[model samples]
Target: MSVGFIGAGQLAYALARGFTAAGILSAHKIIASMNLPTVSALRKMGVNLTRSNKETVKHSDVLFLAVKPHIIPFILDEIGADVQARHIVVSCAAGVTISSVEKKLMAFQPAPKVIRCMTNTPVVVQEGATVYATGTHALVEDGQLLEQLMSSVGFCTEVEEDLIDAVTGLSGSGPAYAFMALDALADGGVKMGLPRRLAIQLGAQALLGAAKMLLDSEQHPCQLKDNVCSPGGATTHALHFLESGGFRSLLINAVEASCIRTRELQSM
Candidate 1:
C-alpha cells in the first residue's frame, strides 16, 4: 500500500524509518512532503520527496498528517477537497479532536476515512507506544491495517477518542517522567560513591528491566515489587525512603495534573 506523509519533521522521520525497517514501504510506495530544506535533505535518502502537498495527497492510499497541532486546521482547509473514501487519513497531532478533523473533511464530496493516533518520541527506536481512535466513518478494516503498519514500530492500542488525551498525558509524556526517575536513581548512587556513568547505566537498565519484567510476566506490579523486597534488607530500607518521600502519591499527582492539562488543551 502506498503511504504519504504530509510533514517531514522528526515524528514523520521516525515513522518513515519504522516503516522502512519493517519493510512496509517499497521504493514506489513511500512518499513524503516537507518544506524546502527538509525536502532537499530527504531526497538524498532516496525517498520520493515533494514540496507540493497536493501531489503527496494525490498519489497515496494512506495519508498521515504529521504536522503540529496548530497547523491541522490550515492543512485541512487546503486539502480537504482532495481527501476521499479510499484514503485513510491518520493525524498524529496532539489535542486535535476527531470531530474537528471530521468536520474539516466533511466539505468533501466523499468524506475521507479519518483516524487519530498518539505516538511518543520513542517510535524512532521502534519501541514506542501508540494509541489510535477511529472517526465515525472509519472501519474496523482501517484500524486493522493501521495496526499492522504501526505494530512494526511498537505496541499499539485502540481506544475511545475521549481517552486520547489521557493516553497523551500518560504514555506520550511518561518518558520524561521515567528519565527524571532514572536521574534521581543515578544521583542516589553518586551520593553512595558509585561512579557517575556506571551509576546512570545501572539505574537506567534497572528501570528498563523492571518495566520489561512487569510487561512480560502475568503477575501484578505490587506482587513483583513485593518479591524484590527482602525481609529487613536494603530494598526495604529504600522502600521506606521512597514512602517517606511520598513517591507514589507524587507520581500519581503528576499524572493527574498531566491529564488535566491534556483536557484543557482539548477544550482549547
Candidate 2:
C-alpha cells in the first residue's frame, strides 16, 4: 500500500528510508508533502514529493501526520476534507491523540480512521520500538496493517492510548538514556587507560550484546546481571558503586520527568 506523509522532516525521512530499505514498500510508493530543501533530497531516492497535502491524502492508502505536534491541527484541517474511507490516518506527532485527530475530521460524515503511534530514532536503523493505539472508528485490520508496516522497522505493538505517555517516557526517550550510559561506560574505560575509539566501540558492543542476550534468552535483566557478578568480584564492587550513586532511581526519575513533560505537551 502507498503511504503519504504530511510533513517531510527528519522523522519522515527516516521512516521513508527505513520502510523502503526493508522492502516493505518501494520509495516511489511513498509520498511526502512539503517543500523543504531537506526533503527535496528525497526525490533522488525516488520518493514522490508534492506541495499539496490534499493531493497526498488523495493518492495514498495510509497517511501519516508527520508534522510537529503544533502543526497537527492545521494539517488535519487541510487534509480532512480529502481523507477518504480507504485512508488510514496515522499520527506520529508526539502527544497527539487519536481523538484529537478524529475531532479535527468531524466534518467528514463517518469520521476518519486514526492511529496514534510513538516511535524512536532507532527506526532509522530498523531497530526501533513502536506502539500504536487505534481510534474509535478504526478497524482491527487497520491496526494489523500498521503493525506490519512498523514491524518492518522494529518491534511494533498495540496498546491502550492511555499507556502511550508512559511509553513516551520509556522506549520513546530510551535511546538518549542508553547513549548517556554508553558514553559514561566509555569514559570509565578511558580513565582505565583504554584508547577512546576502542573504549567507545567496546562499550557499544557490550550493550548491544547484552540487549541481544536478554531478548534471545527471554530472561529477566536482573537475573542476567547477577550472572555476571561473582561473590566479591570486580563487577560486584562496580554494582555497589552504581547503587550508591542512585543509578536506578536516577533512571526512574528520568522516565517520570519525560512522562510528565509529555502530558504537559498534550495539554498545550
Candidate 3:
C-alpha cells in the first residue's frame, strides 16, 4: 500500500522504517512531504520525499498528518479538497479528536476515513505504545489497516475515542516520566559512588528490563516488585525511601495533571 506523510519527522520516519522491516510495505511505498534529520533518515531507507504537501496527499492511498498539533487545522483545510473516501487520514497530533478531524475534512467529500492516534516518542525505537480511535464513517477495514500499519512500530490497540485523552496522559506523556526517573536513578547511583555513565546505562536498562519482564511474565507489577524485595534487604530499604518520598503518589498525580491539561486543551 502507498503511504504519504504530511510531515517528515522522527515519528513518521520510525513508522516508515518499521513498516518496511515488517514487509507490510516497502520503503518505496512511503512518501513524505515537507522541506526537511528525518530527511537523511528516510532517504537512507529508500522512501520517496518531497516538499509539496498537496503532491504528497495525492501520491498515496494512506495519509498521515504528522504536522504540529496547533497547525492541524490549516493543514487539514489545505488538504481537505484532496482527501477521498479511499484514503485513510491518520492524525498523530496530540489532543485532537477523531470527530474534530472528520469535521475539518468534511470540506472535500461527504465522508472521509479519519483515525486519531496517540503514540509516544519512543516509536523512534520501534517500541512505541500506540492507540487509535476511528471516526464516524470509518469502517472496520480502516481500523484494521491502521492497526496493521501501526503494529509494525509498536504495540497497537483500538479504543473508544473518549479514552484517548487518558491515553495521552499515560503513554503519550509517559516517556518523560521514564526519562526523569532514569536521570534520578543515575544521580542516586552517582551519590552511591557508581560512575555517571554506568549508572545511566544500568538505570535505563533496568527500566527496559522491568517492562519486558512485566509483559513476558504477565504478572501483576506489585507481584513482580514484591519478588524483588526480601525481608530486610537492600531493595526493601531503597523502596522504603521511595515510599517515604511518595514516589507512587507523585507519579499518579503527574498522570492526573497531564490528563487535566489534555482535557483543557480539548476545549481550546
**How well is each residue in 180-254 modelled by candidate 3, as lDDT tens digits?**
988888998989999999999998888999999998899999999999988888998888888998989998999
- What would the per-residue lDDT of candidate 2 be over residues 29-142, giving only the tens digit for each residue? 877784575587788887776878887888888998889989887877788789877789999988887777888787774757999999887888898899999789899999
Error at 230, model 3, angstroms: 1.3
Structure candidate 2, residue pairs in collision? none
Clashes of each: 0, 0, 0
In candidate 1, position 159 carries an lDDT of 91
Model 1, runs deviating above 4 Å: 26-28, 34-44
Window of ten residues with lowest summed lDDT in model 2: 32-41
TM-score of 3: 0.93
Which residues of candidate 3, in runs, are more than 4 Å off? 34-36
Give the per-residue lDDT of model 1 (tens digit) for 19-102.
766687754577887455545555665678676778888787899999988788889887776787888899999889888888
Which residue pairs of candidate 1 clash?
none
Which residue pairs collide, candidate 3?
none
The local distance difference test score of model 1 is: 0.83
lDDT of 3 at 97: 75
TM-score of each: 0.90, 0.94, 0.93
Please tell me which predicted candidate would have the highest lDDT against the true structure.
2
